[PDB]
Amino acid sequence: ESETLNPSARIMTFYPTMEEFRNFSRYIAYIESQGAHRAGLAKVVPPKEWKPRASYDDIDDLVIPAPIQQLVTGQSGLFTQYNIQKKAMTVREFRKIANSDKYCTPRYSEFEELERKYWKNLTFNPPIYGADVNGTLYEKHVDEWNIGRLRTILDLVEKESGITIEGVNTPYLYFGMWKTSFAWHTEDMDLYSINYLHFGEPKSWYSVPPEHGKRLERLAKGFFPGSAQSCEAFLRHKMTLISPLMLKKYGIPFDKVTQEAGEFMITFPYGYHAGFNHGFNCAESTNFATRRWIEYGKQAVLCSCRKDMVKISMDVFVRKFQPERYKLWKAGKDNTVIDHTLPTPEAAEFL
Numbered sequence: 001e002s003e004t005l006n007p008s009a010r011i012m013t014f015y016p017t018m019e020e021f022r023n024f025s026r027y028i029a030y031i032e033s034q035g036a037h038r039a040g041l042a043k044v045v046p047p048k049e050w051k052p053r054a055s056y057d058d059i060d061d062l063v064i065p066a067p068i069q070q071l072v073t074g075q076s077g078l079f080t081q082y083n084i085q086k087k088a089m090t091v092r093e094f095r096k097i098a099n100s101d102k103y104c105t106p107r108y109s110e111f112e113e114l115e116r117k118y119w120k121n122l123t124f125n126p127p128i129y130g131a132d133v134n135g136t137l138y139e140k141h142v143d144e145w146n147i148g149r150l151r152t153i154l155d156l157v158e159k160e161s162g163i164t165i166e167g168v169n170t171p172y173l174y175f176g177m178w179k180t181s182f183a184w185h186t187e188d189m190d191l192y193s194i195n196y197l198h199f200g201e202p203k204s205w206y207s208v209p210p211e212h213g214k215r216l217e218r219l220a221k222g223f224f225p226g227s228a229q230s231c232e233a234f235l236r237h238k239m240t241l242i243s244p245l246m247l248k249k250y251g252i253p254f255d256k257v258t259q260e261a262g263e264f265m266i267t268f269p270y271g272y273h274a275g276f277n278h279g280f281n282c283a284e285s286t287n288f289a290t291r292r293w294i295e296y297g298k299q300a301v302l303c304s305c306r307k308d309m310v311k312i313s314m315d316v317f318v319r320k321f322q323p324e325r326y327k328l329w330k331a332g333k334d335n336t337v338i339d340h341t342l343p344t345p346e347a348a349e350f351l
């Protein structure tokens with residue numbers, strides 16, 4: 001029934017109308033009814049009728065409080081990325097640097113060409129990434145797909161505890177330049193992710209199907225035995241880069257997609273993704289949830305070596321949506337196995 005939907009677990013692209021696009025949670029259930037989640041990542045092109053801001057020509061004095069210089073070390077498809085924190089910076093300053101001859105995009109024809117230059121020049125001339133900036137670039141009046149208030153059940157965290165977790169139930173802005181990267185990771189508590197590329201050069205993405213996630217971890221634990229012994233989930237450190245050739249060489253299935261300005265990317269629970277920016281650009285993102293996430297949340301393996309890391313209490317979710325399992329769960333007897341192929345319950349109206 002569900003194992004027949006998207007059996008190649010390939011990344012799918014959707015073009016909703018305006019009526020379809022009005023309701024966020026339902027559209028997510030819809031693309032899951034089509035098996036999009038099996039790829040771990042999906043692209044949703046919004047209608048030409050739509051825009052979250054009239055103009056971005058007024059944002060150059062916005063502060064990037066904590067820019068990050070990305071220093072990559074390693075060879076032949078395997079890399080560790082170190083962060084060097086630089087002093088605060090404005091968007092206009094960031095733009096100048098990004099566009100300067102030292103840091104700007106090299107010339108290319110096909111995307112494959114830029115892909116090769118990225119994996120060969122990754123460890124040279126470390127770029128600066130304006131990541132994890134608190135804020136949104138949506139006008140306050142836009143009610144469709146507003147990253148600051150998506151109204152999913154993730155709201156239960158704030159609603160019943162008051163806790164805000166920056167970037168997780170609040171938006172982050174990312175200012176990229178050529179060769180800035182995000183390492184292999186799943187989301188905090190294995191939540192969903194949504195990413196909107198407001199403007200600029202493209203952002204390319206790699207993804208591994210959730211049903212093969214463990215194979216990627218097995219491979220990673222084998223290449224970084226030291227890290228694996230020191231932490232139960234070292235990939236959440238967001239430092240590990242692994243080229244597609246390396247994945248191919250060891251038979252991890254993956255897919256890749258390029259996100260262009262004005263497009264959304266959705267990641268799904270336990271979907272490993274990575275990628276890099278093509279040039280100066282600006283993206284907004286946050287996490288969200290569906291009822292299907294709850295079981296992922298109950299089973300997520302967290303970082304065990306840093307106290308700073310993100311942990312959401314699952315208790316309120318299991319009481320409200322799985323009350324008959326609560327005593328079993330709280331007593332450590334909930335042996336439920338996850339089927340990565342089943343769509344979230346909210347998809348019932350489409351099947």
Ligand SMILES: COc1cccc(CC(=O)Nc2ccc(O)c(-c3cc(C(=O)O)ccn3)c2)c1
Nearest residue numbers: 131132174181182187188193195237238239283
């Ligand atoms: C010691 O290493 C770190 C510690 C704390 C925070 C970070 C920053 C980070 O990668 N944050 C983050 C956390 C979760 C994510 O989903 C993304 C992310 C980033 C992008 C992107 O760069 O556009 C795309 C997809 N995901 C980024 C690194």
Ligand SMILES: [Mn+2]
Nearest residue numbers: 185186187193
């Ligand atoms: Mn992510």
Ligand SMILES: [Zn+2]
Nearest residue numbers: 231303304305
């Ligand atoms: Zn750790």
